[PDB]
Design a protein around this ligand. Structure first.
Ligand code: 3PH
Ligand code: 9Z9
Ligand code: 9Z9
Ligand code: NA
Ligand code: NA
Lengths: 544, 205
């Protein structure tokens, strides 16, 4: 049980380590689900055939498949991290992939047979598996083909909508309801109290958060675009309050992380790039604010810090756009193409620096050491490749001042530089982007579909009010959206449905295999050989 | 697809424009001209109108504004993001969706020829500038075709022959496929093996 808890993850708990089993153990029977124990034993001993036999006997096939996938993945990681023979690691990875494929195929069969029971099967609480659900087990194993399935996506959509039945045109009606509280009563609800069920759906919280962020960005633009007084204005106070409330919310969401160690939660949180960028931006804003309430030079420096800081808050709108079905994958593609762009920026820089150094050295041969020399190398050669070409400045004529020695070479090297930069490298980068688009697009779609789950969970676990108004909610401090509690009779119904689905899956697989061309050809050849031998023996006899 | 990228381009452009305007002009009364300086020049820049002496004026010269050296750096980053990354990504998007769009457009145009022909069949002879008179003044072919009994029977017989030939050709194609031949051969081989086993089972000697 301890090893199972170690391998499964953070908050998992095994039945062997609970009080009931310990009390039974330390005063000495039976297992209501023996095949659960048998399959766990087979997986832990790396016996794949035995585990596959045990999987298709008993109840809860999909939960067992997901647990086996997670356990094999963890065991492979542990073997790889202890410097073992490294073939055990690939064997364990193959086992994990086999179990994941089994889970995906079972989900597909269940969804095809009956959609409502398929959705019910992915959410009911698993008493035998640490009170988890199939969706949680799939997310913990990072099974992307499972979450990106149609049934999982529709379940995520239903959890996103909450207790609201509208599906044809959302967003506009949510915004209208937030802006017009009396307009809430005109909406239809699933099976007064409509206000509570409206202001607690994740989509309503998301739209409230988005509107608050838009207003905050508007106020930030206003304060940077107008002249500052000695002390902050009302809009500046609102901006500071929003920044502070967002900072304390980010701080307190670190203390609700799964690990029990304060220093462990910090490094777990510092794994999303948006969190690191948010922390850096908040620190920079704090520095600029504490430097703004001083004498004029420090005030100017703080204002410049504000001006630089507003760019990040502008760029952060892409994170909000990532909720759209089309904009999110595009942002992921941009992030993936930045690396290919950076691999060409270096070559372009080499060529640009060569040209700039040559031009500066030739045209200005009597220069004292100065820092302006480092600027003239990069400035104009960089502006030239974006259309700002001026022949009278790249090579000035020479009433006119005497001609510098070798001044005629500057136009020639300029022509070569323009040809290399604007024709060769640009077109090569275009070809690189063109020929890698398909796989990047597919991967981005899959990753966005997988990451919808964390967005839905995050907005389910958040307060009703947005950051500028959660100042009070900090002092004041799952029937659905996470789980689904089922009764005994409905549990039996779900078990029977799952057993029928797995039986149909195996029968269909056998029928497909037996009717393939290769199997028919093989069987025909064997039967023909045996028949030929039998006929030869029959003709061998001489009864005449 | 172009509109889905215009939004990202607008976000980047507005960030750069607000930063530049705020840094370079620190003493401004609220005015509607501020809303114009954010979009105007940053938009013209990405179409070739780049002027380094105006994006970052030198500073005999007026005193240097605090942080005036950051404008060329953010300008370089903005140009690199706009003219290299997003443009090439949009080119790739157009390139990789061209085939299906072209095929669908061809099919839709071929379908929509019919309504054009009907519309110009149902229209007056005179063109709009002088159809006024027609307004006051107010199908053997082009829509239908009226046929006689003998020709109707001919058309019926032709259709019956065509459907019979269609079914016969479909059956002939199905029966001569490799899969059907393999299946029939396997079944016959199995039955023949069972029959030969039964024949060899007897012992008349
Ligand atoms: C102050 C200067 C502003 C610097 C802000 C750039 C940092 C944003 C990166 C955010 C991130 O890392 O998320 C990763 C994010 C996801 O990682 P994950 O959430 O941890 O899985 O990857 C992305 O999809 C973001 C890709 C879009 C960012 C490209 C736009 C950068 C333009 C900057 C130049 C603007 C021109 C200047 C005017
Ligand atoms: C010449 O005399 C004019 C005077 C009126 C002066 O009022 C000014 C007050 C600030 C205000 C309303 C004005 C110009 C810039 C305006 C900004 C542009 C910003 O752009 C947006 C751009 C896009 C948004 C995402 C961010 O903000 C605005 C929220 C922002 C914006 C509309 C805030 C409002 C600003 C007009 C006459 O009075 C009778
Ligand atoms: C106005 O008064 C200023 C004066 C300071 C004078 O010192 C100068 C001495 C040469 C030095 C340090 C300076 C400017 C160009 C500098 C070059 C730029 C080159 O770029 C790099 C570019 C990229 C590299 C690959 C190649 O070299 C440098 C190795 C190169 C580089 C840093 C060599 C160093 C040069 C400053 C005051 O003194 C107290
Ligand atoms: Na140009
Ligand atoms: Na150009």
């Amino acid at each position: 049980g301890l090893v199972i808890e170690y391998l499964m993850g953070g908050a998992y708990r095994c039945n062997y380590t609970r009080k009931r089993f310990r009390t039974l153990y330390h005063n000495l029977n039976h297992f209501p689900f023996p095949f659960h124990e048998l399959m766990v034993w087979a997986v832990l001993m790396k016996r794949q055939k035995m585990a596959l036999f045990f999987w298709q006997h008993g109840e809860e096939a999909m939960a067992k498949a997901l647990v086996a996938c997670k356990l094999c993945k963890a065991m492979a990681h542990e073997a790889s991290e202890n410097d073992m023979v490294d073939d055990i690691s690939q064997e364990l990875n193959h086992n994990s992939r086999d179990f994941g494929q089994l889970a995906v195929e079972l989900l597909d069969q269940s969804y095809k047979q009956d959609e409502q029971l398929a959705m019910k099967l992915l959410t009911y609480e698993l008493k035998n598996w640490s009170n988890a659900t199939c969706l949680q087990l799939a997310v913990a194993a990072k099974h992307r083909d499972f979450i990106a399935h149609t049934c999982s996506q529709m379940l995520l959509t239903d959890m996103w909508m909450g207790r609201l039945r509208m599906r044809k045109n959302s967003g506009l009606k949510v915004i209208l309801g937030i802006l017009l509280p009396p307009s809430i009563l005109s909406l239809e609800f699933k099976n007064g109290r409509k206000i509570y069920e409206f202001y607690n759906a994740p989509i309503v919280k998301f739209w409230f958060y988005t509107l608050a962020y838009i207003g905050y960005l508007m106020l930030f633009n206003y304060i940077v675009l107008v002249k500052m007084e000695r002390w902050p204005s009302t809009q500046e106070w609102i901006v500071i309050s929003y920044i502070f409330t967002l900072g304390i919310e980010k701080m307190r969401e670190i203390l609700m992380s799964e690990p029990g160690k304060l220093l462990q939660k910090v490094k777990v949180w510092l794994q999303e790039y948006w969190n690191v960028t948010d922390l850096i931006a908040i620190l920079l804003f704090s520095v600029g604010m504490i430097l703004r309430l001083q004498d004029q030079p420090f005030r100017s420096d703080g204002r410049v810090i504000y001006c630089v800081n507003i760019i990040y808050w502008y760029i952060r709108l892409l994170d909000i756009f990532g909720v759209n079905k089309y904009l999110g994958p595009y942002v992921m593609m941009i992030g993936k193409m930045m690396i290919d762009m950076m691999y060409f920026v270096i070559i372009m820089l080499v060529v640009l620096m060569s040209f700039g150094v040559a031009r500066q050295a030739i045209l200005f041969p009597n220069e004292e050491p100065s820092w302006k020399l480092a600027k003239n190398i990069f400035y104009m050669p960089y502006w030239m490749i974006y259309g700002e070409v001026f022949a009278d400045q790249i090579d000035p004529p020479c009433q006119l001042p005497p001609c510098k020695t070798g001044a005629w070479i500057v136009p020639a090297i300029m022509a070569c530089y323009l040809l290399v930069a604007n024709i060769l490298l640009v077109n090569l980068l275009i070809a690189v982007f063109n020929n890698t688009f398909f796989e990047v697009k597919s991967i981005s779609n899959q990753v966005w579909k997988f990451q919808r789950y964390q967005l839905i969970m995050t907005f389910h676990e958040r307060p009703v009010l947005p950051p500028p108004l959660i100042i009070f909610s900090h002092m004041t401090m799952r029937d659905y959206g996470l789980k689904l509690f089922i009764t005994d009779d409905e549990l039996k119904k779900v078990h029977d449905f799952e057993e029928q689905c797995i039986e149909e899956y195996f029968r269909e697989k056998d029928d497909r295999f037996n009717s393939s061309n290769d199997e028919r050809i093989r069987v025909t050849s064997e039967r023909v050989e045996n028949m030929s031998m039998r006929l030869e023996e029959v003709n061998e006899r001489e009864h005449s």
